[PDB]
Amino acid sequence: SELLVNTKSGKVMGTRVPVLSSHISAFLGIPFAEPPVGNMRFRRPEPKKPWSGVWNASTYPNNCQQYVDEQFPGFSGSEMWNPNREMSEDCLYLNIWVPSPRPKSTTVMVWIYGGGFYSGSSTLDVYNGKYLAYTEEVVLVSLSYRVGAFGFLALHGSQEAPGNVGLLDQRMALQWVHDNIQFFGGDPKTVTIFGESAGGASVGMHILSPGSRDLFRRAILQSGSPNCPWASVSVAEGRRRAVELGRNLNCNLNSDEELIHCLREKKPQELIDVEWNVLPFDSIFRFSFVPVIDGEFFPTSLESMLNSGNFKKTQILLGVNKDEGSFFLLYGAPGFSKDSESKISREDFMSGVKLSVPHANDLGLDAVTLQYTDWMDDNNGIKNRDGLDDIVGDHNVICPLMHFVNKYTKFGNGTYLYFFNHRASNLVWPEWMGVIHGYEIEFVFGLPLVKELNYTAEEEALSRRIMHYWATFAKTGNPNEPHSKWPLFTTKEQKFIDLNTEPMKVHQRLRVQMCVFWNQFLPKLLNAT
Ligand SMILES: CC1=C[C@H]2Cc3[nH]c(=O)ccc3[C@]3(C1)NCCC[C@H]23
Ligand SMILES: *[C@@H]1O[C@H](CO)[C@@H](O)[C@H](O)[C@H]1NC(C)=O
Ligand SMILES: *[C@@H]1O[C@H](CO)[C@@H](O)[C@H](O)[C@H]1NC(C)=O
Numbered sequence: 001s002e003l004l005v006n007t008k009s010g011k012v013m014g015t016r017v018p019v020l021s022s023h024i025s026a027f028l029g030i031p032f033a034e035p036p037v038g039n040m041r042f043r044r045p046e047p048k049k050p051w052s053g054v055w056n057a058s059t060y061p062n063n064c065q066q067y068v069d070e071q072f073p074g075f076s077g078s079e080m081w082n083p084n085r086e087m088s089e090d091c092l093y094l095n096i097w098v099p100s101p102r103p104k105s106t107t108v109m110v111w112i113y114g115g116g117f118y119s120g121s122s123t124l125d126v127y128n129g130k131y132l133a134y135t136e137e138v139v140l141v142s143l144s145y146r147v148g149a150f151g152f153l154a155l156h157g158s159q160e161a162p163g164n165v166g167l168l169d170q171r172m173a174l175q176w177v178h179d180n181i182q183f184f185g186g187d188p189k190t191v192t193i194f195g196e197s198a199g200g201a202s203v204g205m206h207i208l209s210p211g212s213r214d215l216f217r218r219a220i221l222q223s224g225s226p227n228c229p230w231a232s233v234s235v236a237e238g239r240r241r242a243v244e245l246g247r248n249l250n251c252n253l254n255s256d257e258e259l260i261h262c263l264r265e266k267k268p269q270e271l272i273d274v275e276w277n278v279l280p281f282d283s284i285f286r287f288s289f290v291p292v293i294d295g296e297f298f299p300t301s302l303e304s305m306l307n308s309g310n311f312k313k314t315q316i317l318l319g320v321n322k323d324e325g326s327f328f329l330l331y332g333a334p335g336f337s338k339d340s341e342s343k344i345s346r347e348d349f350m351s352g353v354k355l356s357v358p359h360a361n362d363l364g365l366d367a368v369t370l371q372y373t374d375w376m377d378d379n380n381g382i383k384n385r386d387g388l389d390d391i392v393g394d395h396n397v398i399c400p401l402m403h404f405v406n407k408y409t410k411f412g413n414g415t416y417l418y419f420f421n422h423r424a425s426n427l428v429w430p431e432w433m434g435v436i437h438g439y440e441i442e443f444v445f446g447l448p449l450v451k452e453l454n455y456t457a458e459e460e461a462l463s464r465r466i467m468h469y470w471a472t473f474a475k476t477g478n479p480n481e482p483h484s485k486w487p488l489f490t491t492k493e494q495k496f497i498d499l500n501t502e503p504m505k506v507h508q509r510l511r512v513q514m515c516v517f518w519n520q521f522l523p524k525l526l527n528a529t
Helices: 130-136 148-150 165-184 198-208 236-248 256-265 268-278 300-310 326-332 346-355 363-373 381-409 458-478 512-528
Strands: 004-007 010-013 015-018 023-029 054-056 093-098 107-110 137-141 186-196 218-220 316-321 415-420 495-499 507-508
Touching: 004 165, 004 236, 010 137, 010 363, 010 507, 023 054, 023 130, 023 458, 054 148, 093 130, 093 165, 093 381, 107 198, 130 137, 130 300, 130 458, 148 218, 148 268, 165 186, 186 198, 186 458, 198 218, 198 300, 218 236, 218 300, 236 326, 300 381, 316 381, 316 458, 346 363, 346 381, 363 512, 381 415, 381 512, 458 495
Parallel strands: 010 054, 107 137, 107 186, 186 218, 218 316, 316 415, 415 495
Antiparallel strands: 004 010, 015 023, 023 093, 093 137, 495 507
């Protein structure tokens, strides 16, 4: 039977699922590690003990314990990202969608969710791999990993809460896939990891980390880069945040062992309740528990690794959306609201600048402000709103990604860059938010192919184009159909393409004007001052 698979960890039984008037197999909730509960909380994941009998892989697993967004109760726009299954620390499972009939050795894609390392679920409707698996005939895997303090509390030096364990969870799932995907018809030597936002930064981190490199072949990064300003902290800052968390739960802070023991005696929600209290500055696009530059998972600083070519050399496909910053300004910056056009005053603009570059001194805040203000029309509310949107997106996603792509391309074996700028016709978020962070995902996963979802014919065609670009690249290292063009991104030309419903257009030097400011000038200014 097609729904029965014997793996090295034991036998699993899947389920048939309908998709676009057809069907494929799905093995949901396959465990890849021992439950990270009790004394195991904060510890590195342990490989799953093989089992006898048949594991029921017919239903989605629990979602990891995480902060739940209740900023707009009942609103589909935000609810679609919240956990849609019971939360539990016993959450280390993966999902696999397999074409029917079962392939023998086909292209494999592994998805990594990316809610800023503090949230995300492999079970969201927007992450349903059945459309992509089916349409492109690939074996689609979505993994899970601990988020928040559970996945990233870091007390460097202790073996109890070393930090980066959520990245280790990802690595274990990649290892399981590498070891067992052949049994589901996938080619373990042709695995492409892909992810968005923190998932995109994660993908880059596995490209960098020596211990993760051999577990996959190619990589796709969507609106996320490993060098993003919010994607990691130093060992010292990580330690400070762990101590501060303990201080918030009235923990004994006499030793690491004292602190860790206390944190393990707290219920999941108690940790989540005070998680946002440990940030060092009032800021946006900053998350509490993220990867730590530790000397193990990351041998040296990211920049020196990038500079010396110390990373997996292969092909990558990546890009960004037009208005990456809007979501974060909506959730926090003074002046933005979901139901108004959010025209911004000069004063709120400046408050926004400060929330956006929290580490900067006044001179630095002045430099940014100068750079993004139209001094002829400095009180124009629309311009202030849009400039702030660009500041957030440029600083947090685009420029860090452009720096990564340029550093990578000097040593890689092929780069393909895109700029996604199509606003979905059925978007429930206000128009001022534009092409929002995370909204290219639904096209990558092919939801536009589903009639009831209300997309236009043009949108369905865009989704098919994107899915085929992603799948062809995963299979060959080139998104273009041989003898059927998305140009290769090179150090010299630096070409990229737009992804929308209009005829493809090739461009060059994506936001180079602003990224020279964020990647070369500002860092220099903050270091001199
Ligand atoms: C940090 C973050 C980054 C984006 C990616 C993401 N991914 C998730 O899985 C859950 C929430 C989210 C986010 C939170 N909130 C919903 C809109 C997308 C963004
Ligand atoms: C688990 O598998 C059994 C069959 O062995 C099935 O009846 C059940 O519905 C599955 N999941 C549930 C509902 O707990
Ligand atoms: C990738 O590597 C192969 C051989 O190692 C080489 O022939 C090819 O030119 C490289 N491609 C790129 C885009 O660098």
